[PDB]
Amino acid sequence: RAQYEAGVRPYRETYYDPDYEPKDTDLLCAFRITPKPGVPMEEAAAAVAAESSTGTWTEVWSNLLTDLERYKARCYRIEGDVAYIAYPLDLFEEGSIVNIMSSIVGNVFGFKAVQALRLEDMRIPVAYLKTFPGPPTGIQVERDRLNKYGRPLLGGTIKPKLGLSAKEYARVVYECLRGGLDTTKDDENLNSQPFNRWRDRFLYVMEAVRKAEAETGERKGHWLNVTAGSTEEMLKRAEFAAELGSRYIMVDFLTAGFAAFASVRRRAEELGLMLHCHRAMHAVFDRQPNHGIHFRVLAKWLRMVGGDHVHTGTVVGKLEGDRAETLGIADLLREDYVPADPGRGLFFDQDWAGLKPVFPVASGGIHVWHVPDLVSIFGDDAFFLFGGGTHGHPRGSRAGATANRVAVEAVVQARNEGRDILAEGREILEEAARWCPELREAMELWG
Ligand X SMILES: O=C(O)[C@@](O)(COP(=O)(O)O)[C@H](O)[C@H](O)COP(=O)(O)O
Active site residue 159: yes
Q: Does residue 231 touch a copy of itself according to CB under 8 A?
A: yes
Interaction with a copy of itself in 398-437: which residues (CB under 8 A)?
none
How far is the CA of 219 from the CAs of 226, 326, 386, in angstroms? Answer: 21, 29, 18
51 burial class (0-12, 13-18, 19+ CB within 10 angstroms)?
A: buried
149, interface contact from ligand X, Mg ion, a copy of itself, none, CB < 5-8 Å by kind: none
Taking CB under 8 A as the criterion, the residue among 13, 18, 81, 130 binding a copy of itself is 130
Active site residue 278: yes
The dihedral region occupied by 162, where left means phi > 0, alpha psi between -120 and 50, and beta the remainder, is beta
Tell me phi and psi for residue 114, to 5 degrees. -100, 115
- DSSP at 278: E
Q: In this chain, which stretch among 158-166, 210-218, 324-332, 373-381 interacts with a copy of itself, using CB under 8 A?
A: 158-166
Tell me phi and psi for residue 78, to 5 degrees. -130, 130
- Centroid of chain to Cα 53: 27
- What is the closest distance, in whole angstroms, from the C-beta atom of residue 357 to ligand X in the complex? 18
Q: Does residue 405 touch ligand X according to CB under 6 A?
A: no
Q: Does residue 157 touch Mg ion according to CB under 5 A?
A: yes
Of 148, 159, 211, 236, catalytic: 159
Q: Are 372 and 364 in contact (CB under 8 A)?
A: no
434, interface contact from ligand X, Mg ion, a copy of itself, none, CB < 5-8 Å by kind: none
Q: Does residue 55 touch ligand X according to CB under 6 A?
A: no
- What is the closest distance, in whole angstroms, from the C-beta atom of residue 108 to ligand X in the complex? 9
Considering the complex, state which of residue 57 and residue 149 has its C-beta at the smaller distance from ligand X. 57
Cα–Cα distance for residue pair 443/366, rounded to 1 Å = 12
Angle at 109 between CA 23 and CA 264, to 5 degrees: 75
Q: Which residues lie closer than 8 Å to 324 by C-beta, 6 or more apart?
A: 343, 344, 345
Site string (274-293) toward ligand X, x via CB under 6 A: -----x--------------
Q: Does residue 252 touch Mg ion according to CB under 5 A?
A: no
Q: Which residues lie closer than 8 Å to 147 by C-beta, 6 or more apart?
A: 218, 219
Q: In this chain, which stretch among 23-31, 108-116, 157-165, 256-264 interacts with Mg ion, using CB under 5 A?
A: 157-165
Q: What is the CA radius of gyration of the chain?
A: 24
229, interface contact from ligand X, a copy of itself, Mg ion, none, CB < 5-8 Å by kind: a copy of itself
Of 72, 222, 276, 278, catalytic: 278
311, interface contact from Mg ion, a copy of itself, ligand X, none, CB < 5-8 Å by kind: ligand X
Q: Is residue 310 within a helix (H) or strand (E), and if so which, with residue range? A: strand 309-311
396, interface contact from ligand X, Mg ion, a copy of itself, none, CB < 5-8 Å by kind: a copy of itself
Cα–Cα distance for residue pair 278/291, rounded to 1 Å = 22
- What is the closest distance, in whole angstroms, from the C-beta atom of residue 426 to a copy of itself in the complex? 19
Name the site residues for ligand X (rule: CB under 6 A): 56-57, 107, 110, 157, 159, 187-188, 279, 311, 313, 319, 363-365, 385-388
